CSV table of C-alpha atoms in Angstrom, one decimal:
chain,number,residue,atom,x,y,z
A,102,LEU,CA,5.5,10.7,-48.8
A,103,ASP,CA,5.5,7.7,-46.5
A,104,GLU,CA,2.8,6.1,-44.3
A,105,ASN,CA,3.0,9.1,-41.9
A,106,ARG,CA,3.3,11.4,-45.0
A,107,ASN,CA,6.9,12.4,-44.3
A,108,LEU,CA,9.3,13.2,-47.1
A,109,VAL,CA,11.2,10.0,-47.8
A,110,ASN,CA,13.6,8.6,-50.5
A,111,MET,CA,13.4,5.2,-52.1
A,112,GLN,CA,14.6,3.4,-48.9
A,113,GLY,CA,12.5,5.4,-46.5
A,114,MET,CA,15.2,7.9,-46.0
A,115,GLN,CA,13.5,10.6,-44.1
A,116,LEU,CA,14.1,14.2,-45.2
A,117,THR,CA,15.1,16.6,-42.4
A,118,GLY,CA,15.4,20.4,-42.2
A,119,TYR,CA,14.7,23.5,-40.2
A,120,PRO,CA,11.1,23.1,-38.8
A,121,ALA,CA,8.5,25.8,-38.2
A,122,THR,CA,8.0,26.8,-34.5
A,123,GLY,CA,5.8,29.2,-32.7
A,124,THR,CA,2.3,30.5,-32.9
A,125,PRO,CA,1.9,31.0,-35.9
A,126,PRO,CA,4.8,28.7,-36.8
A,127,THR,CA,7.8,30.5,-38.3
A,128,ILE,CA,11.1,29.4,-40.0
A,129,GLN,CA,13.8,29.3,-37.4
A,130,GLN,CA,17.3,29.0,-38.8
A,131,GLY,CA,18.8,28.5,-35.4
A,132,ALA,CA,16.5,25.6,-34.5
A,133,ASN,CA,17.8,22.1,-34.6
A,134,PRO,CA,17.2,20.2,-37.9
A,135,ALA,CA,14.0,18.1,-37.7
A,136,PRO,CA,12.2,15.8,-40.1
A,137,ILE,CA,9.8,17.6,-42.4
A,138,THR,CA,6.2,16.5,-41.8
A,139,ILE,CA,3.2,17.2,-44.0
A,140,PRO,CA,0.1,16.1,-42.2
A,141,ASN,CA,-3.3,16.1,-43.9
A,142,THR,CA,-5.1,17.5,-40.8
A,143,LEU,CA,-7.4,20.5,-41.5
A,144,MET,CA,-6.4,24.0,-40.4
A,145,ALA,CA,-8.3,25.7,-37.6
A,146,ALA,CA,-9.4,29.3,-37.7
A,147,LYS,CA,-7.6,32.3,-36.1
A,148,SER,CA,-9.8,35.2,-34.9
A,149,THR,CA,-9.1,38.5,-36.6
A,150,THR,CA,-7.1,40.8,-34.4
A,151,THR,CA,-5.8,43.5,-36.8
A,152,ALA,CA,-7.4,44.8,-40.0
B,153,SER,CA,31.2,27.2,-26.8
B,154,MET,CA,28.9,29.3,-28.9
B,155,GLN,CA,30.3,31.5,-31.7
B,156,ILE,CA,28.0,33.8,-33.6
B,157,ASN,CA,28.0,36.8,-35.9
B,158,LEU,CA,25.8,39.7,-34.9
B,159,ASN,CA,24.4,42.3,-37.3
B,160,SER,CA,24.7,45.9,-36.1
B,161,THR,CA,21.7,47.2,-38.1
B,162,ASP,CA,19.0,45.0,-36.6
B,163,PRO,CA,16.3,47.2,-35.1
B,164,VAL,CA,15.5,46.9,-31.4
B,165,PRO,CA,12.2,45.0,-31.2
B,166,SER,CA,9.3,47.2,-30.3
B,167,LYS,CA,7.6,44.4,-28.3
B,168,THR,CA,9.5,44.9,-25.1
B,169,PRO,CA,10.1,43.2,-22.7
B,170,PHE,CA,11.4,39.8,-23.6
B,171,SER,CA,8.8,37.0,-24.0
B,172,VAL,CA,9.5,33.4,-25.0
B,173,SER,CA,6.2,33.1,-26.8
B,174,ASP,CA,6.8,36.4,-28.7
B,175,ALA,CA,9.0,35.4,-31.7
B,176,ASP,CA,9.5,39.1,-32.7
B,177,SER,CA,10.6,40.0,-29.1
B,178,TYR,CA,14.1,38.6,-29.8
B,179,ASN,CA,16.6,39.3,-32.6
B,180,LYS,CA,18.2,35.9,-32.9
B,181,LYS,CA,17.4,32.4,-31.6
B,182,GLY,CA,19.9,29.5,-31.3
B,183,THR,CA,19.8,26.0,-29.9
B,184,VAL,CA,22.6,23.9,-28.3
B,185,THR,CA,22.1,20.4,-27.1
B,186,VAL,CA,23.6,19.5,-23.7
B,187,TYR,CA,23.4,16.3,-21.7
B,188,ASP,CA,23.0,15.4,-18.0
B,189,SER,CA,24.4,12.6,-15.8
B,190,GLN,CA,21.7,10.2,-17.1
B,191,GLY,CA,22.4,11.3,-20.7
B,192,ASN,CA,19.1,13.2,-21.2
B,193,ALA,CA,19.2,15.7,-24.1
B,194,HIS,CA,18.4,19.3,-23.1
B,195,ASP,CA,17.9,21.7,-26.0
B,196,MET,CA,19.2,25.0,-24.5
B,197,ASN,CA,17.4,27.7,-26.5
B,198,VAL,CA,19.3,31.0,-26.4
B,199,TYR,CA,17.9,34.3,-27.4
B,200,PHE,CA,19.8,37.4,-28.5
B,201,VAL,CA,18.3,40.8,-28.1
B,202,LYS,CA,20.2,44.0,-28.8
B,203,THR,CA,19.8,46.5,-26.0
B,204,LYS,CA,22.0,49.4,-27.3
B,205,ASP,CA,25.0,49.7,-29.6
B,206,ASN,CA,27.5,46.9,-28.9
B,207,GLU,CA,25.3,45.6,-26.0
B,208,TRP,CA,23.5,42.3,-26.5
B,209,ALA,CA,21.4,40.5,-23.8
B,210,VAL,CA,21.5,36.7,-24.1
B,211,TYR,CA,18.7,34.7,-22.5
B,212,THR,CA,18.6,30.9,-21.9
B,213,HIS,CA,15.8,28.4,-21.4
B,214,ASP,CA,15.5,24.7,-21.7
B,215,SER,CA,12.5,23.3,-23.7
B,216,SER,CA,12.9,19.8,-22.2
B,217,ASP,CA,11.6,20.7,-18.7
B,218,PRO,CA,8.0,21.8,-18.6
B,219,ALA,CA,8.5,22.8,-14.9
B,220,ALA,CA,11.4,25.1,-15.6
B,221,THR,CA,11.0,28.8,-14.8
B,222,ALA,CA,10.4,31.2,-17.6
B,223,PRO,CA,13.5,33.4,-18.3
B,224,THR,CA,12.8,36.9,-17.1
B,225,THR,CA,16.3,38.0,-16.1
B,226,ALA,CA,19.4,38.4,-18.2
B,227,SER,CA,21.3,35.2,-18.5
B,228,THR,CA,24.3,37.2,-19.7
B,229,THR,CA,25.2,40.5,-21.5
B,230,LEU,CA,27.8,40.7,-24.2
B,231,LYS,CA,29.6,44.0,-24.5
B,232,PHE,CA,31.6,44.7,-27.6
B,233,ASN,CA,34.4,47.1,-28.6
B,234,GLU,CA,34.6,49.3,-31.6
B,235,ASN,CA,36.0,46.9,-34.2
B,236,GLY,CA,34.0,43.8,-33.2
B,237,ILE,CA,36.2,42.4,-30.5
B,238,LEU,CA,34.6,41.0,-27.4
B,239,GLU,CA,34.9,43.1,-24.2
B,240,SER,CA,33.1,41.4,-21.3
B,241,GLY,CA,30.3,39.0,-20.4
B,242,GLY,CA,31.4,36.3,-22.8
B,243,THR,CA,31.2,33.4,-20.3
B,244,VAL,CA,28.2,32.4,-18.1
B,245,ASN,CA,27.4,29.4,-15.9
B,246,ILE,CA,24.2,27.7,-17.1
B,247,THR,CA,22.1,25.2,-15.2
B,248,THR,CA,19.5,23.0,-16.9
B,249,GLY,CA,16.3,21.4,-15.5
B,250,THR,CA,15.9,18.2,-13.6
B,251,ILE,CA,14.4,15.6,-16.0
B,252,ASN,CA,13.6,12.0,-14.9
B,253,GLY,CA,15.9,12.1,-11.9
B,254,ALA,CA,18.9,13.4,-13.9
B,255,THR,CA,20.8,16.1,-12.1
B,256,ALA,CA,20.7,19.5,-13.8
B,257,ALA,CA,23.6,20.1,-16.1
B,258,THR,CA,25.8,22.9,-14.8
B,259,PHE,CA,28.1,24.0,-17.6
B,260,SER,CA,30.1,27.1,-18.5
B,261,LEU,CA,28.9,28.5,-21.8
B,262,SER,CA,31.4,30.8,-23.5
B,263,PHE,CA,30.9,33.3,-26.3
B,264,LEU,CA,34.6,33.5,-27.1
B,265,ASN,CA,35.6,34.3,-30.7
B,266,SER,CA,32.3,35.9,-31.3
B,267,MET,CA,32.5,38.9,-33.7
B,268,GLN,CA,29.9,41.6,-34.5
B,269,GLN,CA,29.9,43.4,-37.8
B,270,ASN,CA,27.4,44.4,-40.6
B,271,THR,CA,26.4,40.9,-41.6
B,272,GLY,CA,23.7,40.6,-44.1
B,273,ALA,CA,21.8,38.2,-41.9
B,274,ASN,CA,21.8,36.5,-38.5
B,275,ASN,CA,23.9,33.4,-38.5
B,276,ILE,CA,25.6,31.2,-35.9
B,277,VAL,CA,29.1,30.3,-36.8
B,278,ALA,CA,29.7,27.3,-34.5
B,279,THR,CA,28.3,25.4,-31.6
B,280,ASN,CA,30.4,23.0,-29.5
B,281,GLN,CA,29.8,21.0,-26.4
B,282,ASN,CA,31.8,18.2,-24.7
B,283,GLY,CA,28.8,16.1,-23.6
B,284,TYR,CA,27.2,13.2,-25.4
B,285,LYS,CA,24.8,10.3,-25.0
B,286,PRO,CA,25.9,6.7,-24.1
B,287,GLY,CA,27.4,4.8,-27.0
B,288,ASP,CA,28.2,1.3,-28.0
B,289,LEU,CA,31.0,-0.2,-30.1
B,290,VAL,CA,30.1,-0.1,-33.8
B,291,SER,CA,33.6,-0.4,-35.1
B,292,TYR,CA,37.3,-0.5,-34.2
B,293,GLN,CA,40.4,0.5,-36.1
B,294,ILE,CA,44.1,0.9,-35.8
B,295,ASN,CA,45.7,4.2,-37.0
B,296,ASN,CA,49.1,4.7,-38.6
B,297,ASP,CA,50.6,5.8,-35.3
B,298,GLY,CA,49.5,2.6,-33.6
B,299,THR,CA,46.5,4.0,-31.7
B,300,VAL,CA,43.6,1.6,-31.3
B,301,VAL,CA,40.4,3.6,-31.7
B,302,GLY,CA,36.9,2.3,-31.1
B,303,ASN,CA,34.1,4.2,-32.9
C,203,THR,CA,7.4,2.8,-10.4
C,204,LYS,CA,9.0,6.3,-10.5
C,205,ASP,CA,12.2,7.9,-11.6
C,206,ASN,CA,15.2,5.7,-10.8
C,207,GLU,CA,12.9,3.2,-9.1
C,208,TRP,CA,12.2,-0.1,-10.8
C,209,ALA,CA,10.0,-2.9,-9.3
C,210,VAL,CA,11.1,-6.3,-10.6
C,211,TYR,CA,8.8,-9.3,-10.7
C,212,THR,CA,9.8,-13.0,-11.3
C,213,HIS,CA,7.5,-15.6,-12.9
C,214,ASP,CA,8.0,-19.2,-14.0
C,215,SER,CA,6.4,-19.8,-17.4
C,216,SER,CA,7.4,-23.5,-17.4
C,217,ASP,CA,5.2,-24.5,-14.5
C,218,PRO,CA,1.7,-25.2,-15.7
C,219,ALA,CA,0.5,-24.6,-12.1
C,220,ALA,CA,2.7,-21.5,-11.5
C,221,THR,CA,1.1,-18.8,-9.3
C,222,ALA,CA,0.8,-15.4,-10.8
C,223,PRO,CA,3.3,-13.0,-9.1
C,224,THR,CA,1.3,-10.6,-7.0
C,225,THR,CA,4.0,-9.2,-4.7
C,226,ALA,CA,7.2,-7.4,-5.8
C,227,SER,CA,10.2,-9.7,-6.0
C,228,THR,CA,12.7,-6.9,-5.7
C,229,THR,CA,13.2,-3.2,-6.2
C,230,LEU,CA,16.1,-1.8,-8.2
C,231,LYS,CA,17.2,1.6,-7.0
C,232,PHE,CA,19.5,3.9,-9.0
C,233,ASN,CA,21.9,6.6,-8.0
C,234,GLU,CA,22.4,9.9,-9.9
C,235,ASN,CA,24.7,8.2,-12.3
C,236,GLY,CA,22.3,5.4,-13.2
C,237,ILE,CA,24.4,2.8,-11.2
C,238,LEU,CA,23.0,0.2,-8.8
C,239,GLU,CA,22.7,1.2,-5.2
C,240,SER,CA,20.4,-1.5,-3.7
C,241,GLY,CA,18.3,-4.5,-4.7
C,242,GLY,CA,20.8,-5.9,-7.1
C,243,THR,CA,20.6,-9.4,-5.7
C,244,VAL,CA,17.6,-11.5,-4.7
C,245,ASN,CA,17.0,-15.2,-4.0
C,246,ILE,CA,14.5,-16.7,-6.4
C,247,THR,CA,12.9,-20.2,-6.1
C,248,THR,CA,11.4,-21.9,-9.1
C,249,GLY,CA,8.6,-24.4,-9.3
C,250,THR,CA,8.5,-28.2,-9.0
C,251,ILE,CA,8.2,-29.9,-12.3
C,252,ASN,CA,8.2,-33.7,-12.7
C,253,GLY,CA,9.1,-34.2,-9.1
C,254,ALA,CA,12.4,-32.4,-9.2
C,255,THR,CA,13.5,-29.9,-6.6
C,256,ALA,CA,12.8,-26.2,-7.3
C,257,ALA,CA,15.9,-24.3,-8.1
C,258,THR,CA,16.7,-21.8,-5.3
C,259,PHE,CA,19.3,-19.5,-6.9
C,260,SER,CA,20.6,-16.0,-6.3
C,261,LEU,CA,19.7,-13.7,-9.2
C,262,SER,CA,22.2,-10.8,-9.3
C,263,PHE,CA,21.6,-7.7,-11.5
C,264,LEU,CA,25.2,-6.6,-11.1
C,265,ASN,CA,26.4,-3.8,-13.4
C,266,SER,CA,22.8,-3.0,-14.4
C,267,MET,CA,22.8,0.6,-15.6
C,268,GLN,CA,20.0,3.0,-16.4
C,269,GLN,CA,20.9,5.9,-18.6
C,270,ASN,CA,19.5,7.5,-21.8
C,271,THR,CA,20.0,4.4,-24.0
C,272,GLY,CA,17.6,4.4,-27.0
C,273,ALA,CA,15.8,1.4,-25.5
C,274,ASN,CA,15.8,-1.3,-22.8
C,275,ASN,CA,18.5,-3.8,-23.9
C,276,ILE,CA,19.6,-6.9,-21.9
C,277,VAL,CA,23.4,-6.8,-22.0
C,278,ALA,CA,24.3,-10.3,-20.6
C,279,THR,CA,22.6,-13.3,-19.1
C,280,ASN,CA,24.4,-16.2,-17.4
C,281,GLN,CA,23.6,-19.2,-15.2
C,282,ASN,CA,25.9,-21.8,-13.7
C,283,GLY,CA,23.5,-24.8,-14.0
C,284,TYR,CA,23.8,-27.3,-16.8
C,285,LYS,CA,21.7,-30.3,-18.1
C,286,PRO,CA,23.1,-33.8,-18.2
C,287,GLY,CA,25.0,-34.8,-21.4
C,288,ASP,CA,27.0,-37.6,-22.9
C,289,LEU,CA,30.7,-37.4,-23.9
C,290,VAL,CA,31.1,-36.1,-27.4
C,291,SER,CA,34.8,-35.4,-27.9
C,292,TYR,CA,38.1,-34.9,-26.1
C,293,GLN,CA,41.3,-32.9,-26.5
C,294,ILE,CA,44.7,-32.3,-25.0
C,295,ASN,CA,45.5,-28.6,-24.6
C,296,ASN,CA,48.9,-27.0,-24.9
C,297,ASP,CA,49.3,-26.8,-21.1
C,298,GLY,CA,48.8,-30.5,-20.7
C,299,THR,CA,45.2,-30.3,-19.6
C,300,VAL,CA,42.9,-33.0,-20.8
C,301,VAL,CA,39.4,-31.6,-21.6
C,302,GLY,CA,36.3,-33.6,-22.5
C,303,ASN,CA,33.6,-31.8,-24.4
D,253,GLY,CA,-26.3,-15.8,-30.3
D,254,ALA,CA,-22.9,-14.2,-30.1
D,255,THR,CA,-21.8,-12.6,-26.8
D,256,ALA,CA,-22.6,-8.9,-26.7
D,257,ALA,CA,-19.9,-6.6,-28.0
D,258,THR,CA,-19.4,-3.5,-25.9
D,259,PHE,CA,-16.9,-1.0,-27.2
D,260,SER,CA,-15.6,2.4,-26.2
D,261,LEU,CA,-16.6,4.9,-29.0
D,262,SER,CA,-14.7,8.1,-28.8
D,263,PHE,CA,-15.3,11.4,-30.8
D,264,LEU,CA,-11.8,12.7,-29.8
D,265,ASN,CA,-10.2,15.1,-32.2
D,266,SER,CA,-13.6,16.0,-33.6
D,267,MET,CA,-14.2,19.7,-33.8
D,268,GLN,CA,-17.2,22.0,-34.5
D,269,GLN,CA,-16.1,25.0,-36.6
D,270,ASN,CA,-17.0,26.9,-39.8
D,271,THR,CA,-16.2,24.1,-42.2
D,272,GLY,CA,-18.2,24.1,-45.4
D,273,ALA,CA,-20.3,21.2,-44.3
D,274,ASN,CA,-20.4,18.2,-41.9
D,275,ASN,CA,-17.4,16.2,-43.0
D,276,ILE,CA,-15.9,13.2,-41.4
D,277,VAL,CA,-12.1,13.5,-41.1
D,278,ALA,CA,-11.4,9.9,-40.2
D,279,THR,CA,-12.7,6.6,-38.8
D,280,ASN,CA,-10.7,4.1,-36.8
D,281,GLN,CA,-11.5,0.8,-35.1
D,282,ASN,CA,-9.8,-2.2,-33.6
D,283,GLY,CA,-12.2,-4.9,-34.5
D,284,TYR,CA,-11.6,-7.2,-37.4
D,285,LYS,CA,-12.9,-10.2,-39.5
D,286,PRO,CA,-11.8,-13.7,-40.3
D,287,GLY,CA,-9.9,-14.5,-43.5
D,288,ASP,CA,-7.3,-16.9,-44.9
D,289,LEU,CA,-3.6,-16.3,-45.4
D,290,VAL,CA,-2.6,-14.7,-48.8
D,291,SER,CA,1.0,-13.6,-48.5
D,292,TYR,CA,4.0,-13.7,-46.3
D,293,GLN,CA,7.1,-11.5,-46.4
D,294,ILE,CA,10.4,-10.7,-44.5
D,295,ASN,CA,11.0,-7.0,-44.2
D,296,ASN,CA,14.3,-5.1,-44.1
D,297,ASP,CA,14.4,-5.4,-40.3
D,298,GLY,CA,13.9,-9.2,-40.2
D,299,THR,CA,10.2,-9.2,-39.3
D,300,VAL,CA,8.2,-12.1,-40.7
D,301,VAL,CA,4.7,-10.7,-41.5
D,302,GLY,CA,1.7,-12.4,-43.0
D,303,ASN,CA,-1.0,-10.5,-44.9
């Protein structure tokens, strides 16, 4: 992980792949390849809708 | 040109009608990058929803323009024959948004060579487009036929 | 200042008493293709340093082009004025022309 | 006798939710302190930077 916590090689080579989009984010194979980002930001809460 | 393989056994989404926000409202999503006169990149998101057997509605929307209208009407409708040959609706004119003064990109998007069978999953075979961004000389070469080619 | 509209200011950093530019020197306007349409040439006058005349020259932005390049890069700069110098070398070219460098 | 320092303090990105306790996610500031040169280096992009 680099300064922005992205997946990098020795040289700083940024890893890329299919990102997660939507609410909640989902894996989209048809989406354009984007760099994989792993932020340390805390997760908010989602109100329960179905139980 | 956008060539895809469509699965016949995908169930029709229960969350009708089509909604961009609703991920489960569409069977497949693809993205093709086009370019305007000023070279701005527009990520045409296309959505495939099966309506009935051998009938697939395809919707289009650009994520680059926040002022673009939400797609509520069929961009095109692919009709397919018995053995997976295309029948009609494989070509449609598509206009992008207006970003930073760039004129909207009006291009003919074609679903030719698309074939629909019992694929195990939803996959897009090929995406091609003849637009690009401005480029600058990074190398030059001479081929065996004598063609001078600048990369 | 907005899409396809670029205000352009000129300032003289060499003059210790140079006035801060407060009015637009020119306005570059761009067509749909990012080409120049107006404002590509403007007459700019420099300051007066060491008692010499200010240089009144036509600055031309010819072939300036605004498109989705990754950043703002200056392609070419040129000016036809030169400083005084002494003779360094000389040569006779293949066409008989005698050139002093 | 220093001149008064007035700064814009912002609690942006702060949130009130059902976290286990009052926890500070991050602090950031633009002010700094004097100190002598220790190291100098030239990065892969040609930048000359002193630390």
